[PDB]
């Protein structure tokens, strides 16, 4: 048994794959619950755990990080993946552990950071870490959140909500916003996040829904762009992904729209 996200095709990733652009030599840090390196489909280049109770980043006791990693790889097959364990088995983590995982990514010369995580409040320490990663040349991508709507108020969670961080919302197979997808002015792009079939611990596969599922489609898109245009800065990658979107509806709901990697890559 095996599956691939339908989101691979929807973002126009196969068009770059056929041209020989598969994310080669790009360093992607998945800052999540760890990654089950033992999966036949997953290749992990390295990593680190900052969860005092779970020392092994190569062990995923939750399943979240393994599912997210598999999405990164389905989009950009040649990318060097790094397991940055900041959340435990329950899917929770301390802000300081998240910070230490961002700092690890900066020191270790990561190209792309994926953060399929969020909370309702931010910290000064958290915005300095994400802004330092952007100052250092890093492409920082995060899930917008699964908060739905609250009238006219933004429901985007942190670190997604910070301007330096690419906030990714969720669409289904028909380009429609998922009911759970967070809204607001801080929402940047849309990616497929409804019933994403990816890898799970102990040679398994299954479907998950969330903004957490949308995010890695964008981090894998960033890796594809960098494999074709090695000289391009994080700002240039961001601009290209944002400026080449398939426009869907109001910006409050959909941001700039759906990412189009074939367009973005020029």
Tab-separated table of N, CA and C in Angstrom, residues 95-245:
chain	number	residue	atom	x	y	z
A	95	UNK	N	6.994	27.128	24.033
A	95	UNK	CA	7.556	28.142	23.141
A	95	UNK	C	9.058	28.209	23.053
A	96	UNK	N	9.723	27.965	24.157
A	96	UNK	CA	11.203	27.930	24.262
A	96	UNK	C	11.798	26.809	23.406
A	97	UNK	N	11.108	25.664	23.345
A	97	UNK	CA	11.558	24.475	22.527
A	97	UNK	C	11.448	24.815	21.031
A	98	UNK	N	10.425	25.510	20.633
A	98	UNK	CA	10.081	26.037	19.263
A	98	UNK	C	11.185	27.022	18.869
A	99	UNK	N	11.560	27.937	19.690
A	99	UNK	CA	12.616	28.911	19.569
A	99	UNK	C	13.958	28.227	19.337
A	100	UNK	N	14.260	27.241	20.171
A	100	UNK	CA	15.502	26.458	20.061
A	100	UNK	C	15.582	25.678	18.731
A	101	UNK	N	14.398	25.277	18.224
A	101	UNK	CA	14.336	24.555	16.915
A	101	UNK	C	14.567	25.522	15.754
A	102	UNK	N	14.085	26.738	15.836
A	102	UNK	CA	14.309	27.877	14.820
A	102	UNK	C	15.811	28.219	14.875
A	103	UNK	N	16.371	28.446	16.035
A	103	UNK	CA	17.797	28.755	16.241
A	103	UNK	C	18.729	27.676	15.712
A	104	UNK	N	18.363	26.360	15.909
A	104	UNK	CA	19.064	25.227	15.343
A	104	UNK	C	19.099	25.326	13.779
A	105	UNK	N	17.976	25.611	13.181
A	105	UNK	CA	17.796	25.785	11.730
A	105	UNK	C	18.626	26.862	11.084
A	106	UNK	N	18.794	28.042	11.820
A	106	UNK	CA	19.628	29.160	11.432
A	106	UNK	C	21.106	28.697	11.506
A	107	UNK	N	21.575	28.163	12.636
A	107	UNK	CA	22.970	27.709	12.779
A	107	UNK	C	23.386	26.596	11.839
A	108	UNK	N	22.425	25.753	11.500
A	108	UNK	CA	22.667	24.626	10.604
A	108	UNK	C	22.452	24.874	9.150
A	109	UNK	N	22.317	26.091	8.719
A	109	UNK	CA	22.184	26.615	7.350
A	109	UNK	C	21.040	26.067	6.556
A	110	UNK	N	19.894	25.938	7.246
A	110	UNK	CA	18.647	25.467	6.619
A	110	UNK	C	18.139	26.527	5.604
A	111	UNK	N	17.657	26.067	4.482
A	111	UNK	CA	17.128	26.804	3.394
A	111	UNK	C	15.657	27.190	3.590
A	112	UNK	N	14.906	26.243	4.061
A	112	UNK	CA	13.478	26.313	4.262
A	112	UNK	C	13.169	25.727	5.657
A	113	UNK	N	12.221	26.446	6.324
A	113	UNK	CA	11.682	25.995	7.623
A	113	UNK	C	10.180	25.772	7.358
A	114	UNK	N	9.675	24.698	7.880
A	114	UNK	CA	8.223	24.420	7.826
A	114	UNK	C	7.783	24.302	9.310
A	115	UNK	N	6.754	25.096	9.659
A	115	UNK	CA	6.203	25.067	11.021
A	115	UNK	C	4.683	24.834	10.916
A	116	UNK	N	4.285	23.544	11.016
A	116	UNK	CA	2.886	23.100	10.959
A	116	UNK	C	2.399	22.947	12.433
A	117	UNK	N	2.362	24.118	13.096
A	117	UNK	CA	2.134	24.496	14.437
A	117	UNK	C	1.681	25.945	14.589
A	118	UNK	N	0.993	26.112	15.767
A	118	UNK	CA	0.508	27.481	16.057
A	118	UNK	C	-0.244	27.482	17.417
A	119	UNK	N	-0.341	28.668	17.914
A	119	UNK	CA	-1.007	29.065	19.159
A	119	UNK	C	-1.659	30.440	18.921
A	120	UNK	N	-2.625	30.751	19.808
A	120	UNK	CA	-3.367	31.975	19.839
A	120	UNK	C	-2.646	33.212	20.260
A	121	UNK	N	-1.544	33.121	20.982
A	121	UNK	CA	-0.748	34.208	21.455
A	121	UNK	C	0.646	34.112	20.932
A	122	UNK	N	1.309	35.238	20.796
A	122	UNK	CA	2.728	35.243	20.367
A	122	UNK	C	3.550	35.691	21.531
A	123	UNK	N	4.824	35.734	21.314
A	123	UNK	CA	5.772	36.263	22.323
A	123	UNK	C	6.753	37.165	21.586
A	124	UNK	N	7.443	38.045	22.277
A	124	UNK	CA	8.533	38.890	21.745
A	124	UNK	C	9.723	38.074	21.296
A	125	UNK	N	10.044	37.000	22.018
A	125	UNK	CA	11.065	35.972	21.837
A	125	UNK	C	10.751	35.184	20.568
A	126	UNK	N	9.489	34.778	20.350
A	126	UNK	CA	9.043	34.134	19.167
A	126	UNK	C	9.121	35.015	17.921
A	127	UNK	N	8.697	36.306	17.954
A	127	UNK	CA	8.846	37.180	16.754
A	127	UNK	C	10.333	37.472	16.556
A	128	UNK	N	11.207	37.600	17.500
A	128	UNK	CA	12.654	37.824	17.200
A	128	UNK	C	13.295	36.625	16.502
A	129	UNK	N	12.881	35.422	16.874
A	129	UNK	CA	13.458	34.203	16.236
A	129	UNK	C	13.079	34.074	14.786
A	130	UNK	N	11.839	34.247	14.382
A	130	UNK	CA	11.326	34.194	13.022
A	130	UNK	C	11.860	35.292	12.107
A	131	UNK	N	11.987	36.498	12.648
A	131	UNK	CA	12.569	37.708	11.971
A	131	UNK	C	14.069	37.513	11.834
A	132	UNK	N	14.730	36.902	12.845
A	132	UNK	CA	16.203	36.564	12.667
A	132	UNK	C	16.323	35.491	11.540
A	133	UNK	N	15.414	34.504	11.472
A	133	UNK	CA	15.544	33.478	10.381
A	133	UNK	C	15.416	34.071	8.952
A	134	UNK	N	14.550	35.064	8.796
A	134	UNK	CA	14.323	35.890	7.552
A	134	UNK	C	15.562	36.761	7.383
A	135	UNK	N	16.114	37.439	8.378
A	135	UNK	CA	17.383	38.199	8.232
A	135	UNK	C	18.544	37.365	7.759
A	136	UNK	N	18.588	36.076	8.141
A	136	UNK	CA	19.612	35.088	7.827
A	136	UNK	C	19.447	34.406	6.491
A	137	UNK	N	18.420	34.743	5.678
A	137	UNK	CA	18.230	34.101	4.359
A	137	UNK	C	17.320	32.911	4.279
A	138	UNK	N	16.577	32.585	5.335
A	138	UNK	CA	15.678	31.505	5.466
A	138	UNK	C	14.264	31.878	5.022
A	139	UNK	N	13.654	30.868	4.314
A	139	UNK	CA	12.288	30.854	3.823
A	139	UNK	C	11.505	30.223	5.034
A	140	UNK	N	10.587	31.021	5.579
A	140	UNK	CA	9.860	30.520	6.788
A	140	UNK	C	8.387	30.440	6.414
A	141	UNK	N	7.933	29.223	6.590
A	141	UNK	CA	6.509	28.857	6.214
A	141	UNK	C	5.865	28.246	7.428
A	142	UNK	N	4.577	28.623	7.610
A	142	UNK	CA	3.793	28.133	8.750
A	142	UNK	C	2.346	27.993	8.288
A	143	UNK	N	1.627	27.145	8.995
A	143	UNK	CA	0.182	26.899	8.944
A	143	UNK	C	-0.535	28.161	9.504
A	144	UNK	N	-1.628	28.533	8.799
A	144	UNK	CA	-2.418	29.720	9.228
A	144	UNK	C	-3.222	29.559	10.479
A	145	UNK	N	-3.686	28.334	10.709
A	145	UNK	CA	-4.411	27.757	11.774
A	145	UNK	C	-5.755	27.199	11.394
A	146	UNK	N	-6.361	26.481	12.318
A	146	UNK	CA	-7.673	25.831	12.167
A	146	UNK	C	-8.759	26.365	13.011
A	147	UNK	N	-8.812	27.712	13.157
A	147	UNK	CA	-9.707	28.491	13.981
A	147	UNK	C	-11.002	28.960	13.474
A	148	UNK	N	-11.292	28.683	12.156
A	148	UNK	CA	-12.466	29.080	11.465
A	148	UNK	C	-12.558	30.678	11.404
A	149	UNK	N	-13.737	31.118	11.653
A	149	UNK	CA	-14.055	32.572	11.615
A	149	UNK	C	-14.519	33.120	12.936
A	150	UNK	N	-14.369	34.429	13.149
A	150	UNK	CA	-14.823	35.099	14.438
A	150	UNK	C	-15.256	36.502	13.941
A	151	UNK	N	-16.325	36.581	13.228
A	151	UNK	CA	-16.860	37.865	12.644
A	151	UNK	C	-15.886	38.484	11.600
A	152	UNK	N	-15.375	39.660	11.884
A	152	UNK	CA	-14.435	40.484	11.169
A	152	UNK	C	-13.024	40.451	11.684
A	153	UNK	N	-12.753	39.723	12.759
A	153	UNK	CA	-11.520	39.509	13.463
A	153	UNK	C	-10.697	38.447	12.730
A	154	UNK	N	-9.387	38.641	12.764
A	154	UNK	CA	-8.395	37.697	12.240
A	154	UNK	C	-8.331	36.553	13.292
A	155	UNK	N	-8.261	35.408	12.610
A	155	UNK	CA	-8.157	34.124	13.378
A	155	UNK	C	-6.881	33.422	13.100
A	156	UNK	N	-5.940	34.046	12.380
A	156	UNK	CA	-4.603	33.505	12.067
A	156	UNK	C	-3.848	33.381	13.434
A	157	UNK	N	-3.236	32.197	13.567
A	157	UNK	CA	-2.439	32.008	14.836
A	157	UNK	C	-0.959	32.283	14.518
A	158	UNK	N	-0.207	32.280	15.613
A	158	UNK	CA	1.241	32.528	15.684
A	158	UNK	C	2.070	31.280	15.533
A	159	UNK	N	3.235	31.274	14.873
A	159	UNK	CA	3.915	32.374	14.289
A	159	UNK	C	3.448	32.831	12.909
A	160	UNK	N	2.422	32.212	12.348
A	160	UNK	CA	1.828	32.453	11.064
A	160	UNK	C	1.498	33.927	10.781
A	161	UNK	N	0.866	34.512	11.818
A	161	UNK	CA	0.422	35.908	11.938
A	161	UNK	C	1.522	36.894	11.768
A	162	UNK	N	2.759	36.681	12.111
A	162	UNK	CA	3.862	37.620	11.867
A	162	UNK	C	4.081	37.865	10.400
A	163	UNK	N	4.258	39.101	9.924
A	163	UNK	CA	4.538	39.419	8.520
A	163	UNK	C	5.721	38.693	7.914
A	164	UNK	N	6.786	38.382	8.641
A	164	UNK	CA	7.961	37.668	8.096
A	164	UNK	C	7.729	36.171	7.682
A	165	UNK	N	6.684	35.644	8.253
A	165	UNK	CA	6.301	34.231	8.152
A	165	UNK	C	5.134	34.140	7.181
A	166	UNK	N	5.286	33.255	6.199
A	166	UNK	CA	4.331	32.843	5.169
A	166	UNK	C	3.267	31.975	5.905
A	167	UNK	N	2.069	32.528	5.835
A	167	UNK	CA	0.883	31.958	6.532
A	167	UNK	C	0.063	31.307	5.475
A	168	UNK	N	-0.072	29.984	5.619
A	168	UNK	CA	-0.746	29.131	4.650
A	168	UNK	C	-2.084	28.631	5.148
A	169	UNK	N	-3.065	28.930	4.372
A	169	UNK	CA	-4.503	28.541	4.575
A	169	UNK	C	-4.785	27.288	3.786
A	170	UNK	N	-5.947	26.623	4.022
A	170	UNK	CA	-6.372	25.427	3.374
A	170	UNK	C	-7.588	25.369	2.484
A	171	UNK	N	-7.335	24.753	1.316
A	171	UNK	CA	-8.370	24.509	0.263
A	171	UNK	C	-8.581	23.016	0.077
A	172	UNK	N	-9.721	22.630	-0.506
A	172	UNK	CA	-9.932	21.160	-0.841
A	172	UNK	C	-9.522	20.961	-2.330
A	173	UNK	N	-9.790	19.793	-2.912
A	173	UNK	CA	-9.564	19.418	-4.292
A	173	UNK	C	-10.267	20.243	-5.366
A	174	UNK	N	-11.315	20.944	-4.998
A	174	UNK	CA	-12.089	21.863	-5.830
A	174	UNK	C	-11.744	23.314	-5.622
A	175	UNK	N	-10.625	23.679	-5.003
A	175	UNK	CA	-10.179	25.072	-4.732
A	175	UNK	C	-10.974	25.921	-3.796
A	176	UNK	N	-11.887	25.248	-3.055
A	176	UNK	CA	-12.754	25.882	-2.054
A	176	UNK	C	-12.095	25.900	-0.708
A	177	UNK	N	-12.269	27.057	0.055
A	177	UNK	CA	-11.666	27.156	1.402
A	177	UNK	C	-12.348	26.080	2.307
A	178	UNK	N	-11.462	25.477	3.094
A	178	UNK	CA	-11.997	24.486	4.114
A	178	UNK	C	-12.530	25.358	5.268
A	179	UNK	N	-13.644	24.866	5.775
A	179	UNK	CA	-14.402	25.474	6.877
A	179	UNK	C	-13.629	25.875	8.087
A	180	UNK	N	-12.649	25.047	8.432
A	180	UNK	CA	-11.708	25.225	9.536
A	180	UNK	C	-10.580	26.212	9.318
A	181	UNK	N	-10.216	26.535	8.019
A	181	UNK	CA	-9.122	27.426	7.698
A	181	UNK	C	-9.261	28.806	8.286
A	182	UNK	N	-8.224	29.248	9.049
A	182	UNK	CA	-8.125	30.538	9.726
A	182	UNK	C	-8.140	31.652	8.661
A	183	UNK	N	-8.669	32.770	9.001
A	183	UNK	CA	-8.888	33.947	8.151
A	183	UNK	C	-8.250	35.218	8.730
A	184	UNK	N	-8.075	36.195	7.830
A	184	UNK	CA	-7.544	37.532	8.272
A	184	UNK	C	-6.630	38.122	7.276
A	185	UNK	N	-6.219	39.340	7.513
A	185	UNK	CA	-5.274	40.042	6.641
A	185	UNK	C	-3.879	39.499	6.518
A	186	UNK	N	-3.486	38.716	7.475
A	186	UNK	CA	-2.164	38.086	7.664
A	186	UNK	C	-1.955	36.803	6.880
A	187	UNK	N	-2.935	36.179	6.324
A	187	UNK	CA	-3.099	35.053	5.446
A	187	UNK	C	-2.462	35.466	4.078
A	188	UNK	N	-1.535	34.549	3.748
A	188	UNK	CA	-0.729	34.867	2.526
A	188	UNK	C	-1.107	34.146	1.276
A	189	UNK	N	-1.144	32.840	1.337
A	189	UNK	CA	-1.384	31.872	0.245
A	189	UNK	C	-2.267	30.727	0.752
A	190	UNK	N	-2.808	30.001	-0.199
A	190	UNK	CA	-3.649	28.839	-0.053
A	190	UNK	C	-2.965	27.630	-0.657
A	191	UNK	N	-3.116	26.461	-0.032
A	191	UNK	CA	-2.547	25.141	-0.473
A	191	UNK	C	-3.568	24.112	-0.091
A	192	UNK	N	-3.502	22.905	-0.719
A	192	UNK	CA	-4.442	21.824	-0.439
A	192	UNK	C	-4.187	21.224	0.992
A	193	UNK	N	-5.256	21.161	1.738
A	193	UNK	CA	-5.195	20.681	3.147
A	193	UNK	C	-6.379	19.925	3.608
A	194	UNK	N	-7.150	19.349	2.679
A	194	UNK	CA	-8.344	18.583	3.115
A	194	UNK	C	-8.008	17.139	2.668
A	195	UNK	N	-8.002	16.221	3.633
A	195	UNK	CA	-7.786	14.760	3.391
A	195	UNK	C	-6.581	14.409	2.555
A	196	UNK	N	-5.451	14.873	3.097
A	196	UNK	CA	-4.125	14.703	2.513
A	196	UNK	C	-3.642	13.317	3.051
A	197	UNK	N	-3.397	12.484	2.045
A	197	UNK	CA	-2.846	11.129	2.277
A	197	UNK	C	-1.360	11.277	2.094
A	198	UNK	N	-0.686	10.878	3.202
A	198	UNK	CA	0.808	10.949	3.322
A	198	UNK	C	1.209	9.745	4.231
A	199	UNK	N	2.494	9.652	4.516
A	199	UNK	CA	3.208	8.717	5.315
A	199	UNK	C	2.873	8.856	6.810
A	200	UNK	N	2.845	7.662	7.418
A	200	UNK	CA	2.658	7.591	8.918
A	200	UNK	C	3.648	6.627	9.470
A	201	UNK	N	4.024	6.748	10.773
A	201	UNK	CA	4.945	5.828	11.413
A	201	UNK	C	4.550	4.306	11.268
A	202	UNK	N	5.578	3.573	11.072
A	202	UNK	CA	5.678	2.096	10.947
A	202	UNK	C	5.078	1.581	9.701
A	203	UNK	N	5.636	2.086	8.601
A	203	UNK	CA	5.316	1.828	7.218
A	203	UNK	C	3.865	1.902	6.836
A	204	UNK	N	3.217	2.975	7.329
A	204	UNK	CA	1.788	3.211	7.094
A	204	UNK	C	1.534	4.451	6.289
A	205	UNK	N	0.295	4.694	5.904
A	205	UNK	CA	-0.237	5.790	5.082
A	205	UNK	C	-1.655	5.995	5.510
A	206	UNK	N	-2.033	7.264	5.474
A	206	UNK	CA	-3.382	7.694	5.856
A	206	UNK	C	-3.562	9.225	5.591
A	207	UNK	N	-4.814	9.579	5.652
A	207	UNK	CA	-5.371	10.918	5.453
A	207	UNK	C	-5.552	11.690	6.730
A	208	UNK	N	-5.128	12.981	6.612
A	208	UNK	CA	-5.196	13.990	7.653
A	208	UNK	C	-5.701	15.302	7.006
A	209	UNK	N	-6.396	16.131	7.716
A	209	UNK	CA	-6.944	17.437	7.274
A	209	UNK	C	-6.455	18.497	8.296
A	210	UNK	N	-6.113	19.627	7.700
A	210	UNK	CA	-5.667	20.770	8.423
A	210	UNK	C	-4.802	21.716	7.653
A	211	UNK	N	-4.580	22.917	8.286
A	211	UNK	CA	-3.643	23.920	7.767
A	211	UNK	C	-2.197	23.401	7.825
A	212	UNK	N	-1.930	22.463	8.740
A	212	UNK	CA	-0.720	21.699	8.968
A	212	UNK	C	-0.300	20.866	7.740
A	213	UNK	N	-1.239	20.483	6.960
A	213	UNK	CA	-1.191	19.679	5.728
A	213	UNK	C	-0.967	20.575	4.505
A	214	UNK	N	-1.452	21.824	4.561
A	214	UNK	CA	-1.314	22.853	3.536
A	214	UNK	C	0.079	23.365	3.461
A	215	UNK	N	0.634	23.757	4.617
A	215	UNK	CA	1.960	24.275	4.823
A	215	UNK	C	3.074	23.586	4.119
A	216	UNK	N	3.276	22.252	4.284
A	216	UNK	CA	4.367	21.534	3.647
A	216	UNK	C	4.356	21.559	2.128
A	217	UNK	N	3.158	21.746	1.554
A	217	UNK	CA	3.002	21.942	0.051
A	217	UNK	C	3.729	23.184	-0.430
A	218	UNK	N	3.724	24.242	0.421
A	218	UNK	CA	4.377	25.529	0.209
A	218	UNK	C	5.845	25.353	0.499
A	219	UNK	N	6.261	24.756	1.663
A	219	UNK	CA	7.699	24.501	1.955
A	219	UNK	C	8.332	23.622	0.830
A	220	UNK	N	7.615	22.611	0.310
A	220	UNK	CA	8.095	21.776	-0.819
A	220	UNK	C	8.156	22.579	-2.138
A	221	UNK	N	7.271	23.553	-2.356
A	221	UNK	CA	7.282	24.483	-3.491
A	221	UNK	C	8.485	25.409	-3.475
A	222	UNK	N	8.882	25.935	-2.304
A	222	UNK	CA	10.031	26.764	-2.043
A	222	UNK	C	11.317	26.021	-2.399
A	223	UNK	N	11.371	24.737	-2.039
A	223	UNK	CA	12.473	23.850	-2.380
A	223	UNK	C	12.579	23.600	-3.872
A	224	UNK	N	11.486	23.366	-4.540
A	224	UNK	CA	11.500	23.267	-6.027
A	224	UNK	C	12.014	24.493	-6.741
A	225	UNK	N	11.578	25.710	-6.316
A	225	UNK	CA	12.031	27.003	-6.856
A	225	UNK	C	13.562	27.140	-6.662
A	226	UNK	N	14.058	26.928	-5.469
A	226	UNK	CA	15.490	27.020	-5.153
A	226	UNK	C	16.329	26.044	-5.906
A	227	UNK	N	15.794	24.847	-6.222
A	227	UNK	CA	16.544	23.862	-7.070
A	227	UNK	C	16.746	24.333	-8.514
A	228	UNK	N	15.844	25.057	-9.099
A	228	UNK	CA	15.913	25.689	-10.434
A	228	UNK	C	16.664	27.041	-10.332
A	229	UNK	N	16.489	27.819	-9.274
A	229	UNK	CA	17.130	29.158	-9.160
A	229	UNK	C	17.888	29.273	-7.888
A	230	UNK	N	19.084	28.660	-7.843
A	230	UNK	CA	19.983	28.599	-6.670
A	230	UNK	C	20.470	29.886	-6.042
A	231	UNK	N	20.620	30.908	-6.826
A	231	UNK	CA	21.038	32.292	-6.556
A	231	UNK	C	19.976	33.203	-5.979
A	232	UNK	N	18.707	32.824	-6.075
A	232	UNK	CA	17.589	33.572	-5.577
A	232	UNK	C	17.517	33.627	-4.057
A	233	UNK	N	17.212	34.808	-3.560
A	233	UNK	CA	17.129	34.987	-2.054
A	233	UNK	C	15.779	34.466	-1.585
A	234	UNK	N	15.574	34.322	-0.266
A	234	UNK	CA	14.291	33.929	0.377
A	234	UNK	C	13.162	34.913	0.000
A	235	UNK	N	13.494	36.204	-0.116
A	235	UNK	CA	12.577	37.268	-0.531
A	235	UNK	C	12.032	37.098	-1.931
A	236	UNK	N	12.913	36.699	-2.839
A	236	UNK	CA	12.639	36.390	-4.271
A	236	UNK	C	11.753	35.194	-4.414
A	237	UNK	N	11.998	34.083	-3.645
A	237	UNK	CA	11.175	32.879	-3.581
A	237	UNK	C	9.771	33.258	-3.060
A	238	UNK	N	9.737	34.035	-1.914
A	238	UNK	CA	8.461	34.470	-1.384
A	238	UNK	C	7.625	35.276	-2.394
A	239	UNK	N	8.193	36.235	-2.994
A	239	UNK	CA	7.602	37.138	-4.017
A	239	UNK	C	7.064	36.315	-5.185
A	240	UNK	N	7.891	35.359	-5.643
A	240	UNK	CA	7.423	34.516	-6.769
A	240	UNK	C	6.251	33.627	-6.444
A	241	UNK	N	6.211	33.050	-5.250
A	241	UNK	CA	5.070	32.243	-4.836
A	241	UNK	C	3.776	33.031	-4.644
A	242	UNK	N	3.829	34.163	-4.088
A	242	UNK	CA	2.793	35.154	-3.841
A	242	UNK	C	2.321	35.874	-5.107
A	243	UNK	N	3.230	36.245	-5.985
A	243	UNK	CA	2.857	36.985	-7.199
A	243	UNK	C	2.328	36.205	-8.350
A	244	UNK	N	2.472	34.853	-8.370
A	244	UNK	CA	2.064	33.928	-9.406
A	244	UNK	C	0.895	33.039	-9.123
A	245	UNK	N	0.161	33.291	-8.049
A	245	UNK	CA	-1.006	32.562	-7.562
A	245	UNK	C	-2.180	32.588	-8.543
